[PDB]
Structure formats: structure tokens, C-alpha cells
UniProtKB/Swiss-Prot annotation, chains A, B, C, D, E, F, G, H, I, J, K, L, M, N, O, P, Q, R, S, T, U:
Disulfide bonds: none
Protein's UniProt name: Flagellar M-ring protein
SUBUNIT field: The basal body constitutes a major portion of the flagellar organelle and consists of four rings (L,P,S, and M) mounted on a central rod. The M ring is integral to the inner membrane of the cell and may be connected to the flagellar rod via the S ring. The S (supramembrane ring) lies just distal to the M ring. The L and P rings lie in the outer membrane and the periplasmic space, respectively.
Originating gene: fliF
Taxonomic source organism: Salmonella typhimurium (strain LT2 / SGSC1412 / ATCC 700720)
Family: Belongs to the FliF family.
Complete-protein stretch covered: 125 to 222 of 560
Cellular location(s): Cell inner membrane; Bacterial flagellum basal body
Chain's role: The M ring may be actively involved in energy transduction.
Signal peptide: none
High-level lineage: Bacteria, Pseudomonadati, Pseudomonadota, Gammaproteobacteria, Enterobacterales
The organism's place on the tree of life at top rank: Bacteria
Description of what induces expression: Inhibited in nutrient-poor medium.
């Protein structure tokens, strides 16, 4: 009951990442989920010479807050490849 | 009871995506469902040089809110390939 | 008890779609059902150069609301291949 | 107890359809039943250049409302091959 | 207990039909029974150039209402091959 | 306990019919029984150019009402090969 | 417990018939019993050019009412090969 | 417990008959017993040109009423080969 | 417990008969017992040209009433080969 | 427990008879016992031209009343080969 | 527990008899016991031309009343080969 | 528990007899015991031309009353080969 | 538990006898024990031309009363080979 | 539990005897024990021409009363080979 | 239930480390989690000649506080390769 | 539990005897123990021409009273080879 | 449940040590954990000619206090290769 | 549980004896223990021409009273090879 | 549950010793733990010509008090190779 | 549970003895323990021409009182090879 | 649970001894533990021509009191190879 609850999450994370990857100014993403009070942390490498606008942050935040059961958009952490914690 | 509840969802998501794909200005979609309080997140790549009108958003939102049991149209997140969180 | 409840639905959806297909100005349909409070979402591609009249919407809506147990005609979503959410 | 309750219905529907087919101005019918509060939806293709009169609707409606246990004639939906929801 | 309750009915229907067939102005009949509050629906093709008189309707109605347990003659629906719902 | 309760009836019906057949102005009979409140329906083809008198109806009615347990002579339906519901 | 209760009756009926056959003006008889409130129905073909007198009816009626447990002589139905319900 | 209770009776009847046969003016007898409130019915063919006197009836009646447990001499029915119900 | 209770009786009857046979004016006897309230019925063929005196009846009656448990001499029926019920 | 209770009696009877046989004016005896309230019936053929005196009856009566458990000398029936019930 | 209780008695009787045989004026004896309230019956053939005196009766009576458990000397019946019930 | 209780007695009797045999004026003895209230019966053949004195009776009586458990010397019966019940 | 309780006694008796044999004026003894209230009976053949004195009786009586559990010296019976009950 | 309780005693007796044998004026002893209230009986053959003094009796009495559990010296019986009960 | 709870953590730690590694001024990281009140400790080797700014600390702290269930950002310890405890 | 409780005693007795044997004026001893209230009896053959002094008796008495559990020195019986009960 | 709880700790200790090793002025570390109220003891060999500053102690203390569940930074003991207990 | 409790004692006794043997003026000892209230009895053969002093008795008494659990020095009996009970 | 609790301790002791060995003025250590209220005892051989300072004692004491669960630094005993109990 | 409790003691005794042997003026010792209230008895052979001083007694007494659980130094008995109970 | 509790102690004792051996003026030690209220006894052979000072006693006493669970330093007994109980 456990070794495929965490093997499901291992692919949901790898699926959520492959969609954020196909999002324009995101060369590669890397999601981790914390499903017990849930939360997630997305690390994105933007395309060389780009920067996510303030609305493009809610794109990725909601793109993840909705794909996971019970995770509000406030518990999602977005981080570039240059530090830069984007989501408050 | 679990490994085919989430294997059902894996095809419902891939079925819901193949119908939104056949919707005109949608070159490819990518759905994720959060079924415990449900919600979904659709990421669509529009046809090159197109943009979903304000009524075409309710098309895709209801096209998904109805294909899933108990998911209201407010919990559906639509996102382009250019950020642009379309559904409030 | 599960893997053929959802395998029944997989054919009911594919049966309901093949009848709407044989409906005149409907080149191909694509039904999804949400059976727990039920609802359905039909996506139809009309014949090239056609448009469903206001009574032809109640045709397809009732053609689906009756073929599924407990689904009222208000919970059925009809959508063209051009956005156009037809059922309110 | 399930896989032949719905395999019974799969033939009752295909039997009810083959009798409506042998009804004069009906080139082919296509019945779906919703047996939990029951209801049915008949889609008929009329013979080329025909139209069901107002009494011929009660023919097909009662021809189906009686062949199914507990289904009143008000819950039967009849639809042509040209939209045209015939039963109110 | 089920797959021969409905396999009994499948022959009772086919037996009741072969007797109505041997009834004079009835070239072929086709009975369906609804046994849970029972009811039946007979569709008869009359001999070419004939029509069932008002007493010949009670013949076929009672010929069926009595061959089935608990089915009153009011719940029997008789229909020609030309629409024409004969039994009220 | 079922598949030979209805296989008994299948021969009782075929036995009751072969005795009515040997009854003079009856070229062939065809009985169906409804044994749960019982009832029966006899369809007789009279000899060419004959007609059952009013007492010959009580012959066949009692010939059947007595051969079946609990079936009164009022619940027996007799019908010719020409419509003609004989028993009220 | 059933398939030889009704296989006993199948021979008792065929035994009761072979004794009535050896009764003078009875060329062949044919008995059916209704054993749950019992009753029986005898159909006799009289010798060519004979007729059972009013006392010869009580012969056959008691010849059957006594050979079956609990069957009064009032529940026995005697019928010729010419209609003619003999026992009231 | 049943198939030799009625196989006992089948020989008791055939034994009781072979003794009445050896009784003078009785060329052959034929007994049937009704053992649940018991009763019996004897059919005797008298020797050609004979007739049982009024005391010879109590012979055969008691010859049977005593050979069966609990059967009074009033429940025994004696019948010739010419109708003629002898025992009241 | 049954098939040799009645197989015991089958020899007791055949033993009781072989002793009455060796009784002088009795060429052959034939006993039947009714053992549930018991009773018996003896049929004797007297030697050609003999007749049992009034005391010779109590011989055979007691010869049987005592050889069977609980059978009084009043429940024993003696009958000649010429009718003639001897025991009241 | 039964088939040798009555197989014991079958030899006790045949033993009691072989002793009465060796009793002088008794050429052969034949005993039957009724053991549930017991009783017995002895049939004796006296030597040709002899007759049991009144005391020789109590010989045979007590010779049997004592060899059987619980059988009083009043329930023993003695009978010659010429009728003649000897014991009252 | 039974077939050697009565096989014990079968030898006790044959042992008691072989001792009375060795008693002088007793050429052969023959004992039967009635062991449930016990009793016995001795039949003795005296030596040719002898007779048991009144004290020789108590010899044989006590010779048997004591060899059997619970049998008083009053329940022992002694009988010669010439009738002659010796013990009162 | 029985077939060697009475096989013990069969040797105790044969042992008690072989000691009385070695007693002087006793050519052979023959003991029977009645062990349920016990008693015994000794039959002795005295040496030719001898007779047991009044004290020699208490010898044999006590020689037996003591060799058996619970048997008083009053319940022991001694008998010669010439009748002569010696013990009162 | 029985067949060696009485096989023990069979040797104790034969042991007690072989010691009394070695006692001077006792050529051979023969003991029987009655062990349920116990008692014993010794029969001794004295040496030819001897007689046990009054004290030699208490020798043999106590020689036996003590070798058996619970047997008082009053319940021991001593008897010569010439009658002569020695112990009161 | 029994066949070696009495096989123990069989050697204790034979051991107790072999020690009394080695006691001077005792050529051979022979002990029997009565172990349920115990007691013993010693029979000693003294050396030819000897006699046990009054103290030599307490030797043998205590030599046995102590070698057996619970046996007082009053319940030990000592007897010579010449009668002579030594212990009171 | 244990050896893969801590084998899950062994990869989550190695996954969390490979994402912090792809973060710009982080040449290699090394995470340890303390999941019972959780906490984590990250040791990072910065790129040669770099230093994490004060906002780049909240990047790595939230990048870890969110990827683990229930771990607040206060319980995360960040340390360089030169001592330098960065998180208070 | 028994056959080595008394096989232990058989060696304890033979061990206790071999130590008293090695005691000076004791050529051979012979002990028997009575272990249920215990007691013992020692028989000693003194060296030819010796006699145990009054203190040498307490030697052997205590040498045995102590080697056995619960046996006081008063219950030990010492006896020479010449009678002579030494211990009171 | 034990042999891999302490085999987990054996690697956590060896993992925690390999990270402190990669910390600059730490040539090799050696951790031991005390997990029941937990505590740990780190022994570090500094690089030749170095010394941990006062902030570099909180580095290693928190680097360990956080990698272990429930271990406060006060229960962590740090020691050089030259004595020098660094953590109070 | 028994056969090595007394096999332990068999060696403890043989061990205790081999130590007293190595005690100077003791050429050989021989111990017996009474372990249920314990006690022991030591028999010692002193070296030729020696005698145990009054303190050498407490040596051997305590050498044994202490080597056995619960045995006081008062329950130990010491005896020479010349009688001489040494311990009071 | 035991043989590896003490086999764990056997390596923890050998691990704790190998770290104290790598501590500078400690050529070899040797730890023993007392884990039930725990305590430990360290014996250290210092490098030839060295001595642990007063702070170097708290090094080794805390290096051990922390590596073991629940062991305070007061229950740790440190001892040189020259006596010298260092920890109070 | 027993045969190695006393096999443990057999080596503890042999171990305790081999240490006292290595004690200077003790050429060989021999310990016995009494472990149920424990006690021990040591027998020591001193080196030829030595004697244990008053403090050397407490050496051996405590050397044994401490090596055994619960044994006070007062219950230890020390004895030389010359009698001489050393411990009071 | 026992044979390795005392096999653990057998090595703990042999381990504790090998550390005291490496203690300077201790050529060899020999420890015994008493673990039920524990205690131990150490016997040490000092190096030839040495003597443990008063502080070197607390070294060895605490070196043992701490290596064993629950053993205070007062219950440890230290003894040289020359008597000399060192620990009070």
C-alpha cells in the first residue's frame, strides 16, 4: 500500500515536470511533492535570457496547485536556476 | 483497489486531452486531475498564431468540468504555452 | 467490481458517441461521462459548413441525458470543434 | 452479478432496436437504456422521405416504455437523424 | 439464479410470439416482457391488406395478459407495422 | 429448483395441449400457463369450418382450469385462430 | 424432492387413465391432476356410438376422486371428445 | 424416504388386486390407494355374465378397508367394468 | 428403518398365511396387515365343498389377532373365495 | 437394532415350536409371537386320532407363556388343525 | 450389546438343560428363559416308565430358579412329554 | 465389558465344580451362578452308593457361598442325581 | 482394567494354595476368593491319616485372611476332602 | 498403573522372603502382602529341629512390619510349617 | 514497512540534492532529512569563488521545506563548505 | 512416574546396604524401605563371633534414618541373623 | 525490527560523517548517535594546522542536530583529535 | 523432571565423598543425602590408626552442611567404620 | 531479541574504542558498557610519555557519554594503564 | 531448564576452584555450592608447610562469597586438608 | 534464554579480565560476576615485586563496577595472589 503510493508520486512529479517544461520560457522543471497538509516545490531553469513575469508565476503555481489533490496555490514554491524564490 | 484507480485516471486524463486536442485552436493539450474536493489543470498549446477567446475558455473548462465527477468549473485551471493563466 | 464498472462506461461512452455520429450534421462525437451526481460532456465536430440549431441541441442533450441513469439534461455539456459551448 | 446484468441490457437494447426497425417508416433504430428511475433514448433514421406522425411517436414510445420494467412513457426520448427531438 | 430467469423469459417471449403468429391476420409478432409491476409490448405485422378489428385486439391482449404471471390486460401494448398504437 | 419448475411447466403445457387437440372441433391447441395468482391462455385452431358452441367453451375452460393447481375457470383465456376472444 | 414428486404424478395419471380405459364405453381416457386444494380433469373418448349415462359419470368421477389423496368428487372435471362438460 | 414409500404403495396396490382377483366373480381388479385421510378405488371386471351381490360388495370393501392402515370402509369406491358405482 | 419394517411385514404375512393353509378346510389363505390402530384382512379359499363353521371363524380370527402386536380380533376381516364376509 | 430383534424372534418361534412338537399328541406346532402388550398364537396338528385334554391345553399355554418375556397365559391362542380354538 | 446377550442366553439354556438331563428320571430336558420380570419353561422327557415325584419337581424347579438371576421358583413351568403341567 | 464378565463366570463355575468334585462322596458336580441378588445351584452326582450327610451339605453350601461375592449360604441350591433337593 | 484384575486373582489364589500345600498335614489345597465384602473358601486334602487340630484351623484361616486385603478371618471357609466344614 | 503395582508387590514379597530366609532358624519363608488397611502373612519353615522363641517372633514380625508402608506389627501373621499360628 | 520508509527517504534526499545542485552557485549539495517534528540539514559546496546571497538562502530553504511533508522553513539548516551556518 | 520411583528405591536400598556392609562387625546387611509415614527394616549378619554394642545400634539406625527423607530413627528396625530385634 | 534499525543508524552515522568530511578544515569525522532522548558525539580531525572557529562549531553542530530526528543542538558533542571538547 | 533430579543427587553425593576423601585422616567416605527437611549421613573409614578429633567432626559436618541447600549441620550424621556415631 | 542486543553492544564498544584511539595522546582504548541505569568504563593506554590534561578527560568522558543512550557523563569511568582513576 | 542449571553450577564450581588454586599457599581447592538461601563449602589443600593466616581466610571467603549470587560471607565454609574448620 | 545469558557472562568476565591485565602492575586477572543484587570478585596476580597502591585499588574496582550493570563499587572484591583482601 506504500511502495506504489510513493511510486505514483514519483511519476506524477515527473509528469507535472514535463508539462511545465512545455511552457515557453521554461527549459526544464523539477517538481517535488509533499503529500502526507500538502506542498510542492518547483525548480525551473528558464530559457537562456528570459525571466518569468508576475503572471507567468501564477501560471506555474496554478498548473501545479490544481494537478495535486488538496494543495493550495500558497504552498507551492517556485525557484529559478539563480536562486530567486519567486513565490512568496 | 488503488493501482487501477490511478491507472483509470491515467487514461481519463489521456482521453480528456485527446478531445481538447480536436478542438480547433488547440494543437495539443495536457490534463492532470486531482481526485481525492477535486480539481484539474489543463495546459494547452494553441495553434501557431491563435488565442482562445473568452467563450472558448468556457468551452475547455466545461469540456473538463463535466467529464469528471464532482469537479466544478471553478476548480479547472487553463494555461497556455506562454504562461497566461486563463481561468481565474 | 471496479475494473468493469469503468470498462462498462468505456463502451457506453463509445456507444453513445456512435449514435450521435449518425445524426446528420455531426461528423463525429466524443462523449465522456462522470458517474459517481452525474454529468457528461459531448464534443461534436459538425459536418463541414453546418451549425446545430437551437432544437438540435436538445436533440443531442436528451439523446445523452436519457441514455445514462440519473443524468439530467442540465448537466450535459455540448461543445463544437470551434469552442462554442452550446449548452448553457 | 454485474457483467451479465449489463450484458442482458446489451441485447435487450439490440432486440428493442430490431423491432422498431420493422416498423415501416423506420430504416434503423438505436436504443439505449438507463436502468439503475429508468429512462431510454431511441434514435431512429426514418425511411428516405418520411416523417413520423404524432401518433407514430406514441407507437415507438410505448413500444419501448412497455418492453422495459418500470420505464414510463415520459422518460423515453425519441430523436430523428435530423435533430428533431420528437418526444417532449 | 439470474442467467436462466432471463433465459426463461427469452423463450416465453419467443413462444408467445409463435402463437400470435398462428392467429390469422398476423403474419409475424414480436413480444417483449418486462417482469420485475409487469408489462409487455407486442408488435405485429398483419397479413398484407388486413387490419385488426376492435375485438381482435382483446384477443391478442388477453392471449398475452394471461400467458404471463401478474400482467393485467391494461399493461399490454399492441402496435402494428405502421405505427398505430392499438391498445390505449 | 428453478430450471425444472419451468421445465415441468413446459411439458404440462404441452400435455394439456395434446388433450385439447383430441377434442373434436379442435385441430390444434396451444396453452401457456402463468404460475407465480395463476392464469392460462389457450389458443385453438378449430377444424376447418367449425365453431365452438357456448358449452364447448366451458369444456376447454374446465379441461384446463382443473389440470392446473389453483387456477379458477375465470382466469382462463380461450382464443380462436380468427381473433375471437371466447372466454369473457 | 421435486423431480420425482412430479414423476410420481406422471405415472399415477397414466395409471388412472389405463383403468378408466378398461371401463366399457371408454375407448381412451386422459387424466391430469392438480396437486398443490386438489383437482383433476379427465377427458374420455367414448366408444364409437356411445354416451355415458348419468350414473356412469359418478363411476369415473369416484374412480378418480378416490385414487387421489384429498380430491373431492366435486373437483373432478369430465369431458367427452365432443365438448360436453359432463361433471357440473 | 419418498421413492420407496410410493414404491411400497405400488406393490400393496398390486398385491391387494391379486387377492380380489382370486375371489370368484372377479376376473380382474385394479386398486388405487390415496394415502396422505385415506381412500381407495377398486375397479373390478366381473366374470362374464355375473354381478356382485349386496353382500359381495362388503366383501371387497372390507377386503381393502382392512388391508390399508386407517382407511374406513366408507372411503372405498368399487366400480364395475360397466360404470355402476357400487359403493355409495 | 423403513425398507425392512415393510420387508418384515411381507414375510409375517406370508408366514401367517402358510399356517392358516395348514388348517384343514383351508386350501390357501392370503393375509394383509395394516400396521401404522392395526387391522388385517384374510382371504381364504376353502377346500372344494366345505364351509367354515361359526367356531372355525374364531380359530382363524384369533390365529391372526394374536400373531400380530396390538391387533384385536374385531379388526380382522375374513372372506371366502365366494364373497361371504365372515367376520362382522 | 431391528433386523436382529426380529431375527431373534424368528428363531425363538422356531425353537418354541420344536419343543411343543416333542410333546406327545402334537405332530407339529407353529408359533407366532407378537412382541411390541405381547401375545402369541400356537397352531398344533395333533397326532392322527388324538385330542388335547383340558389340562394338556395349560401345558402348551404355559410352555409358551413362560418362554416369552411378559406374555401372560391369557394372551396365548391355541388352535388345532380342525379349527377348534382351544384357549378361550 | 444385544447379539451376545441373546447368545449368552442361548448357551445358558443349553447348559441348564444338560444338567437336568443328568438327573436320573430325565432322559432329556429343554429349557427356555424369558429375561427382560423373568420366567422359564422346562420341558422334560422322563425315562421310559417313570414319573417325577412331588419333591423331584422342586429339584428341577430350584435347579433352574437359582441358575438364573432374579427368577423365583414360582415363575418356572415344568411340563412332561405327556402334557402334565407339573408346576402350578 | 460383557463378553468376558460372562466368560469369567463360565470358568469360575467350572472351577468351583472341579473342587467339589474333589470332595470324597461327589463323583461330579455342576455349578451355575446367577450374578446380577446372587444365587447358585449345584447339582452333584454322589459316588455310587453314598449319600451326603447333613453336615456335608453345609460343606458344599459354604464351599460355594464363599467362593462367590455376595452370595449367602441360603441362596445356594444343592441337588443330587436323584432329585432330592438337599438345601432347603 | 478387568481382564487382569481377575487374572491377578487367578494367581493369588494359586499362590495362596501352594503355601498352604507346604504346611505339613495338607497334601493339597484349593483356594477361591470373592473380591467385590470379601470372602474365601479353602478346600484342603489332608495327608492320608491326619486331621487338622483346632489351632491348625486358625493357622490356615489367618494364613488366608491376611494374604487378602480386607478379608476378616470370619469370612474364610475351610473344608476337608470329607465334607467337614471346619470353620464355623 | 495396575499391572506393575501388583508386579512390584510380587517382588517385594519375594525380596522380604529371601531376607527372612537368611535369619538362622528359618529354612524358607513365604510372604504375602495385602495392600489396598494393610496386612501380611508369613509362613516359615524352621530348620529341622528348631522353634522360634518369643523374641524371634518379634524379629520376623518387625522385619516385615517395617519393610511395608503402613503395616503395623499387629496385622502380621506368622505361621510355621506345623500349623502353630505364632503371632496372636 | 520500515526498510522502504527509510529507503524512500534515501532517494528523496538524493533527489532533493540533485535539484539544489542545478541551482547556479551550488556545485554540489548534500541533504539529510529527519522525519519522525521534522527537520533537514543541507550542506552545499558553492561554485569556486561564489557566495549565496541572503535571498538565495530562502531559495534553498524553501526548495527543501516544501519538498518534504510538514517541514517548516525554520527547521532547515544550510551550511557551506567553509563552516558558515547560513540559516539561523 | 512410578516405575522409576520404585526403581530409585531399589538402588537406594542397595546403596544403603553396601555402606552398612563396610562398617566393621557387619558381614552383610539388607535394607528395605517403606516410603508412602516412612520406615525401614535393616537385617544385618554380624561377623562370625561378634555382637553390636548399644552404641553401634544407633550407628546403623542413624546411618539409615538420615539417608532417607523424613524417616525418624524410631521407625528403623534392626535385626540380626539370630532373631534379636535390636531396635525397640 | 531491530537488526535494521541499528543497521540504518550504522549508515546514517557513516553518511553524516562523509558530509562533515567535505567541510573544509575537517580531514575526517566520526559520528556516533544515541537514539533511544537522543544525543550524538562527533570526533573530527582537522586539517593539519587548522582550528575550528566559534561559528564553525555551530556549523558542525547544526549539520548533525538537523540530520537526526529529535536531537537538539545542545546534545551534540564535538571533539578534536587533540582532546579539546568544543561543544559545551 | 525426576530421573535427573535423582541423577544429580547421585553425583553430588559422589562429589561430596571425593572431597572428604581428600581430608587427611579419611581413607574413604560415603555420603547419602535425603532431599525432599533435608539430612545427610556420612560414613568415613579413617586412615589405619587414626581418630577424628572433636573439631575434625565439625570440619566434615560443615563440609557437607554447606554443600547442600538447606541442610543444617545438626541433620548430618557422621559414622566411622567401627560404629561410633560421632555427630550427636 | 537478546543475542544481537548484546552483539550490537559488542560492536558499539569496539567502535567507541576505535575513535578514542584516534584522539592524540591515546595509543589504545578499551570500552565496556553496562546497559540494563547505564554506565561505562574506558581504559586508555596513553602514548608513551604523555598524560591526559583535566580538559582532555571531559573530551573522552563526553565522547562516550553522548555515543550511548541515557548515559550521563558522571557514570563514565576513565582509567589509565597505570591505575590512576581519572574520572571521579 | 534443569540439566544446564546444574551443569552451569558444575563449571562455576570448577572455575571458582581454579582461581583459589592460583592464590599462593593453596595447592588445590575444591568448591561445592548450594544454590536453591545459598551456601558454599571450600576445601583447600595448602602448600606443604603453610597455613592460612586470619586475613587469608577472608580472602578465600570473599573470593567465593562475591562470585556467587546472594551468598553472604557467613555461609561459606573453609576447611583445610587436616580438618581445621577455618570459617566459624 | 538461559544458556546464552550465562554464555554472555562467560565472555564479559573474560573480557573484563583482559583489560585489567593491560593495567601495568597486573600480570593476570581473573573476574567472576554474580548477576541475579550483583557483585564481582577479581583476583589479580601483580607483576613480580609490585603492590597495588590505595588509588590503584579504586582503579580496578571502578574498572569493574562500571563495566557491569547495577554493580556498585562496594560489592567488588579484589584479592592478590598472596591472600590480601584489598577491597574492604
Amino acid at each position: 500500500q506504500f511502495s506504489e503510493q510513493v511510486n505514483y508520486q514519483r511519476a506524477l512529479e515527473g509528469e507535472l515536470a514535463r508539462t511545465i517544461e512545455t511552457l515557453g520560457p521554461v527549459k526544464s522543471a523539477r517538481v517535488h511533492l509533499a503529500m502526507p497538509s500538502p506542498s510542492a516545490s518547483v525548480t525551473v531553469t528558464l530559457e537562456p535570457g528570459r525571466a518569468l513575469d508576475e503572471g507567468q508565476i501564477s501560471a506555474v503555481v496554478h498548473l501545479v496547485s490544481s494537478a495535486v489533490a488538496g494543495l493550495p496555490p500558497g504552498n507551492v514554491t517556485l525557484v529559478d536556476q539563480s536562486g530567486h524564490l519567486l513565490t512568496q
